[PDB]
Ligand binder design. Structure first.
Ligand SMILES: CC(C)C[C@H](NC(=O)c1cc(C(C)(C)C)nn1C)C(=O)N(C)N(C)C#N
Ligand code: NA
Length: 216
């Protein structure tokens, strides 16, 4: 069990994105995880398309919510696991409206998944899984994120799962051990788009729904 893991420094995390007023956290969470699994399977890091899921995934509900596992299922059942690049299928739902799904010939496939896993809902198991396998898509209570600016959150409201984000690392070398979370509220929010949360107390209910795609 390493004292610290940072998948950002290891090259597995793309720049921070901004979901805007759309309830598409589920798509940002899922895509961020896919980006990491894709890189860790030996491919070049590439930013992938949340918009494809928001507009095309009919198991989920666009700007009205979704679930990361359902997003993976939609890809597996409808595109043979293929996801387009962000550059070719950019995010346009920041104002809450969802355009029709595109099948333009200018779309470029950026990645392919072949399965998914639901990781045991235990913080200690998540840390071991993340240390070996990469960033985890999680659900949590983000109520305490509304006022967060910087530092390690040691008091998180843990009442209701109301957001989805990406767990990119942890560090246990200081007095307060912490997880590092990539949010989808733009690079000006929090610590250049990230938040740190204490480990070992199920802070923010972060161990309730840890999931990942699988890449060959
Ligand atoms: C992981 C989970 C907590 C994410 C959460 N999921 C929902 O809210 C949700 C899912 C569904 C169906 C029934 C699956 C279609 N319907 N709603 C309203 C979500 O999407 N959040 C918090 N958004 C808005 C972000 N942004
Ligand atoms: Na900031």
């Amino acid at each position: 069990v390493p004292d610290a893991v940072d998948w950002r420094e290891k090259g597995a995390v793309t720049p921070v994105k901004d979901q805007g007023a759309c309830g598409s956290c589920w798509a940002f969470s899922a895509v961020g995880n896919i980006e990491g699994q894709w890189y860790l399977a030996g491919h070049e890091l590439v930013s992938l398309s949340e918009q494809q899921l928001v507009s095309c995934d009919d198991m989920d509900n666009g700007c009205s919510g979704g679930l990361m596992l359902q997003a993976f299922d939609w890809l597996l059942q409808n595109t043979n696991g293929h996801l387009h690049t962000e550059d070719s299928y950019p995010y346009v739902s920041g104002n809450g409206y969802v355009p029709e799904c595109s099948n333009s010939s200018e779309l470029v496939v950026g990645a392919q998944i072949d399965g998914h896993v639901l990781i045991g809902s235990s913080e200690k198991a998540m840390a071991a899984w993340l240390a070996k396998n990469g960033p985890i898509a999680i659900a949590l209570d983000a109520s305490s994120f509304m006022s967060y600016k910087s530092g390690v959150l040691t008091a998180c409201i843990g009442k209701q799962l109301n957001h989805g984000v990406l767990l990119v690392g942890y560090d246990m070398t200081g007095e307060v051990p912490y997880w590092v979370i990539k949010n989808s509220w733009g690079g000006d929010w929090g610590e250049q788009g990230y938040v740190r949360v204490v480990m070992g107390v199920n802070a923010c209910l972060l161990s309730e729904y840890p999931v990942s795609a699988h890449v060959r």
